[PDB]
Design a protein around this ligand. Structure first.
Ligand SMILES: OC[C@H]1O[C@H](OC[C@H]2O[C@@H](O)[C@@H](O)[C@@H](O)[C@@H]2O)[C@@H](O)[C@@H](O)[C@@H]1O
Ligand code: CA
Ligand code: CA
Length: 410
């Protein structure tokens, strides 16, 4: 194996090298390129990756700096995050309408939220601030036209009604909105965020995307079947995001119901996604060549989000941290690929490097996921997410409410 992770010093060094290798995929800080995105989209034959994955990358680097103290990439990341905000400072840039799903917008919002929680340096005074960007995403997601009576509520996957998939009310869209609301409640101490988060979680439970018996977390259902045609694929990031938001709700509310939800979601995740201590993407990983570019990034979110759960729901620490350690050990074991001797693949549990070309990408998601897993080994040494008591970001009471905002011509 190339990377060492047995001590704090070794983990820092490994994370710094992993941060370098992941950055090689990113061209957006170079002359003539677009900040904030990885190469793509594949629909234009520009590269393998969609817009939302750029937002995921930004958040991974906000976390990297928080966990390691290394600010080397902070300028590049601030530039990327700011470039993609759109004219209404809401992460709805219209050039990206095809990529405008509530989830895609949500991931950008979550990265802004993370920047506020982590005290990431503020943008210039005349630019949108991190908390305000998170508030704008949440506000647009709470807008009445996104909450119709079909399936008794819930967000649709897509924002534009003409986007393919507008008829799919899926877990990830709702989980993003839930997680933002829970996080905004904790940061701002404003209970209206929390009331929305409660409502959306209760909807996910009622519609049966959360299994009442096992606490498995399914993918979604379609409005023309009243959401009853549940797609029971279990993607790791769905359960993990609900766990993350539930942990923020437990920390904010101190309500035993939320502690029980954390515990039940966590039991399910350990049962379903961790295979002898290693995270495993159950709908696709069992054979090579099935995971999409998006799926290759999920395990990295699992690691980062579960690590934060241990800070804000500290009773979970002993269930989570040993398992994240075994999973990260497997991640680095297989980061041995040519031509560098340290290239990372996806198939951690297998114990073997598999070239990312088997899944038809250059390998940025796998690189991101290992970076996430290794960095998050430092969670014990990191500060917990800040609230407005110690944060440095600023909000906006009219975030998401501009008169030129897209909701005004829906
Ligand atoms: O990969 C599982 C995932 O697949 C579909 O959404 C894929 C992917 O689309 C991107 O554009 C972005 O929206 C991202 O969040 C999403 O993962 C969909 O069927 C979804 O429900 C499912 O979880
Ligand atoms: Ca999308
Ligand atoms: Ca490709």
């Amino acid at each position: 194996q190339y990377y060492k992770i047995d001590t704090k010093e070794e983990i820092l060094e490994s994370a710094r090298t992993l941060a370098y290798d992941m950055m090689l995929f990113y061209k957006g800080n170079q002359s003539g390129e677009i900040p904030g995105i990885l190469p793509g989209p594949p629909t234009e034959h520009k590269g393998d990756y969609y817009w939302w994955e750029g937002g995921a990358m930004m958040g991974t680097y906000v976390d990297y700096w928080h966990l390691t103290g290394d600010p080397s990439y902070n300028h590049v990341i601030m530039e990327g995050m700011l470039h993609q905000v759109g004219p209404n400072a809401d992460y709805q840039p219209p050039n990206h309408t095809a990529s405008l799903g509530n989830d895609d917008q949500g991931f950008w919002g979550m990265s802004a939220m993370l920047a506020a929680e982590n005290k990431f340096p503020n943008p210039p005074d005349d630019k949108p601030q991190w908390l305000a960007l998170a508030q704008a995403v949440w506000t647009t997601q709470a807008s009445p036209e996104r909450h119709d009576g079909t399936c008794n509520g819930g967000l649709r996957w897509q924002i534009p009604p003409t986007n393919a998939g507008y008829n799919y009310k899926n877990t990830i869209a709702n989980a993003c909105f839930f997680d933002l609301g829970a996080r905004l409640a904790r940061y701002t101490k404003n209970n209206t965020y929390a009331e929305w988060a409660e409502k959306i979680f209760d909807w996910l439970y009622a519609v049966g995307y959360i299994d009442h018996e096992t606490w498995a977390v399914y993918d979604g259902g379609h409005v023309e079947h009243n959401c009853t045609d549940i797609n029971r694929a279990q993607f790791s990031y769905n359960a993990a995001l609900l766990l993350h938001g539930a942990a923020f709700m437990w920390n904010y509310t101190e309500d035993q119901k939320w502690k029980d939800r954390v515990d039940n979601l966590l039991t399910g995740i350990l049962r379903d996604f961790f295979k002898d201590g290693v995270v495993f993407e159950i709908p696709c990983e069992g054979r090579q060549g099935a995971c999409t570019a998006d799926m290759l990034t999920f395990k990295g979110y699992v690691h980062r989000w579960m690590a934060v759960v241990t800070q804000i729901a500290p009773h979970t620490k002993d269930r989570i941290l040993p398992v994240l350690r075994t999973s990260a050990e497997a991640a680095v074991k297989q980061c041995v690929g040519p031509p560098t001797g340290r290239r990372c693949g996806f198939y951690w549990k297998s114990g073997k490097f598999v070239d990312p070309s088997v899944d038809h990408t250059s390998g940025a998601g796998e690189a991101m996921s290992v970076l996430a897993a290794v960095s998050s080994l430092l969670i014990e040494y990191a500060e917990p997410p800040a609230t407005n008591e110690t944060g440095i970001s600023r909000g906006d009471p009219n975030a998401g409410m501009r008169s030129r905002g897209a909701a005004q011509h829906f």
